[PDB]
Structures are given as C-alpha cells and as structure tokens.
Amino acid sequence: IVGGRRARPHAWPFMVSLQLRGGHFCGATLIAPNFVMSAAHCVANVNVRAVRVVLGAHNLSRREPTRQVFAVQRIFENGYDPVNLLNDIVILQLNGSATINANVQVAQLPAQGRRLGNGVQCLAMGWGLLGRNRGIASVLQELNVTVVTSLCRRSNVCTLVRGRQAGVCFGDSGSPLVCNGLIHGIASFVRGGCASGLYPDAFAPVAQFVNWIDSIIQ
Ligand SMILES: *[C@@H]1O[C@H](CO[C@@H]2O[C@@H](C)[C@@H](O)[C@@H](O)[C@@H]2O)[C@@H](O[C@@H]2O[C@H](CO)[C@@H](O)[C@H](O)[C@H]2NC(C)=O)[C@H](O)[C@H]1NC(C)=O
Ligand SMILES: CC1=C(C(=O)OCCO)[C@@H](c2ccc(C#N)cc2)NC(=O)N1c1cccc(C(F)(F)F)c1
Ligand SMILES: *[C@@H]1O[C@H](CO)[C@@H](O)[C@H](O)[C@H]1NC(C)=O
C-alpha cells in the first residue's frame, strides 16, 4: 500500500498473509474457518504445497502468538484468464480449521451480483510495497479509496484516490477491498505502476462470484 497508514492491530481479523519460505508474497481473506480467498495470479506458478496461510497477523517482522498458520489442502479456481485479466480469484482450502477469536474472524461477503456505485467509499489494505524501493510493509497498512467506474471494466471493481498518489502495490495482490463492511474486491492489478494518480486500481469483483464461493464453502 502506497500512501496509506498503519492499521490498528487486528482491526481486520479476516486479513490473511500468504507466505513462502521467503515470507509474505500476497494477501487473502478468511471466508470460513477452513477457506481463504485470494487472487488467482498470486498462486499461478507457485508451489501451493509450500504456501503458509498466516491468520491473526499484524506485524510480520515480529513473532506473534496471535497467529495461526495453515497449509493449503485444495485449490478451487473459476476461469482465471491472465491474458484478458479476468476471474482473478481462487479459493484455498486449509489443512484444518481456524480458531475464531478476537484476532481471527471470517469476513462477510456481499449478495450475488451486487454492483458498487461510483463514489462508494472503501478501505484497501495489505502488507505490499510502501512505494519505490521502500520494500514491503512490516505492519498491515490500510488506505481510504473511492470506487470509480471510469477507466474501469465492468468485469472489475476499480478504486482511485483523488488529489494525491496512493494505491495498492506489489504484495497487496489478493488482499480484500472492504466496502460498507463487506468484502467487495480482491486486489488484482495496477496500471501505470503503483499509485500513478492516473489509473484506478482494479479488483476482482467478489459480488460476481458469490454463488460459486457459496457452492464451495457452504
Ligand atoms: C476512511 O475510511 C474509514 C473506514 O471506512 C469505512 O469502514 C470500512 C471498513 C469500509 O466499510 C468502508 O466502506 C467504510 O466507509 C471511514 O471511517 C468511517 O467514517 C464514518 C463517517 O465519518 C464513521 O461514522 C464510521 O464510524 C467510520 N467507519 C469505520 C468502520 O471506522 C472514513 O470516513 C473514511 N474517510 C474518508 C474521508 O473517506
Ligand atoms: C502482481 C501483478 C501481476 C502478476 O503477478 O502477474 C503475473 C502472472 O503470471 C500482473 C497481473 C497479471 C494478470 C492478472 C490477472 N488476472 C493480475 C495481475 N499485473 C499486476 O498489475 N500486478 C500487480 C502489481 C501491483 C499490485 C497489484 C494488486 F493486485 F493490485 F495489488 C497487482
Ligand atoms: C496444517 O499445516 C501446518 C503448517 O505446516 C501444520 O503446522 C499443521 O500440523 C497442519 N495441521 C493439520 C495437518 O491438521
């Protein structure tokens, strides 16, 4: 997240860090005790048996007792098309079930097909790059953003910060976009580099996939 701020510790207990031996590479959202959802592009060309699913985290630089770590048992995809940038969503079934507590909670999703109007106010978040050569965040970051339909496709939810350069960035992929308390987006792609101040950020539209999500987690 470029131009954001530190989240209050465990403000967003559905927030997940996906990690390899090397550490954080993508976000995800806890959608049931034994399922997280993320961007398909996070796991294309990754060894999924090596992925650690880290719940309950805040400061990735410290050891945190609040954390629960799982492995990935199964992957569900839904037509990921990297060439057209479509269907950038994947569900990862965990090798166990999370212990739901103050720090680890499942997110609420929208109704199937629910679109967001121009001007809806959301929060983006992630442990991604803070900006040019500032590296990934240690502490979870959040950012006020605004839904825009201009310079966006119908197959995405797009957001833009007006009046300054701020937005999601590498490492934020797969992270939730929270709008009116519901997970309406999964961070998918940027244009013109991160925080261009020109192109809106693009998210997979969670509302378009709710029936499919339910078929799997329910
Ligand atoms: C900056 O964003 C915060 C948080 O956004 C809200 O909560 C998110 C989880 C998500 O649901 C968004 O869609 C929401 O808009 C805003 O904080 C809220 O502000 C209102 C009005 O001042 C306040 O009454 C609420 O209690 C706040 N909600 C929460 C959850 O803290 C804030 O307004 C945004 N600021 C700007 C200028 O856009
Ligand atoms: C991170 C990545 C790509 C990437 O790994 O592709 C490699 C795939 O092999 C590539 C991309 C290609 C296809 C899709 C789709 N469907 C999505 C993204 N384009 C891209 O913009 N990012 C990127 C950069 C900064 C922030 C974010 C965000 F998710 F928004 F947080 C994403
Ligand atoms: C799930 O994977 C984690 C991380 O490797 C491991 O600690 C734990 O034993 C596993 N839980 C199971 C198999 O129930």
Curated annotation (Swiss-Prot):
It is an enzyme of class 3 (hydrolase). Changing I91F: In SCN1 and CH. Changing F14L: In SCN1 and CH. Changing R114H: In CH; uncertain significance. Changing R191Q: In CH and SCN1; loss of interaction with NOTCH2NL and loss of NOTCH2NL and NOTCH2 proteolytic cleavage. It comes from the Eukaryota. One of its GO terms (molecular function) is protease binding. The keyword Protein biosynthesis does not apply. Glycans are attached at N59, N95, N144. Bone marrow cells. Neutrophil. Keywords: Cytoplasmic vesicle, Disease variant, Disulfide bond, Glycoprotein, Hydrolase, Protease, Serine protease, Signal, Zymogen. It is found in: Cytoplasmic vesicle, Phagosome. GO terms for cellular component: azurophil granule lumen; cell surface; collagen-containing extracellular matrix; cytoplasm; cytosol; extracellular exosome; extracellular region; extracellular space. Its EC number is 3.4.21.37. Its main location: cytoplasm. Changing R52P: In SCN1 and CH. Residues 1-218 form the Peptidase S1 domain. It is linked to Cyclic haematopoiesis: Autosomal dominant disease in which blood-cell production from the bone marrow oscillates with 21-day periodicity. Circulating neutrophils vary between almost normal numbers and zero. During intervals of neutropenia, affected individuals are at risk for opportunistic infection. Monocytes, platelets, lymphocytes and reticulocytes also cycle with the same frequency. Belongs to the peptidase S1 family. Elastase subfamily. Interacts with NOTCH2NL. Interacts with agaphelin, an antihemostatic protein from Anopheles gambiae. Serine protease that modifies the functions of natural killer cells, monocytes and granulocytes. Inhibits C5a-dependent neutrophil enzyme release and chemotaxis. Promotes cleavage of GSDMB, thereby inhibiting pyroptosis. Promotes blood coagulation. Through the activation of the platelet fibrinogen receptor integrin alpha-IIb/beta-3, potentiates platelet aggregation induced by a threshold concentration of cathepsin G (CTSG). Cleaves and thus inactivates tissue factor pathway inhibitor (TFPI). This is Neutrophil elastase. The chain holds residues 30 to 247 of 267 of the full protein.
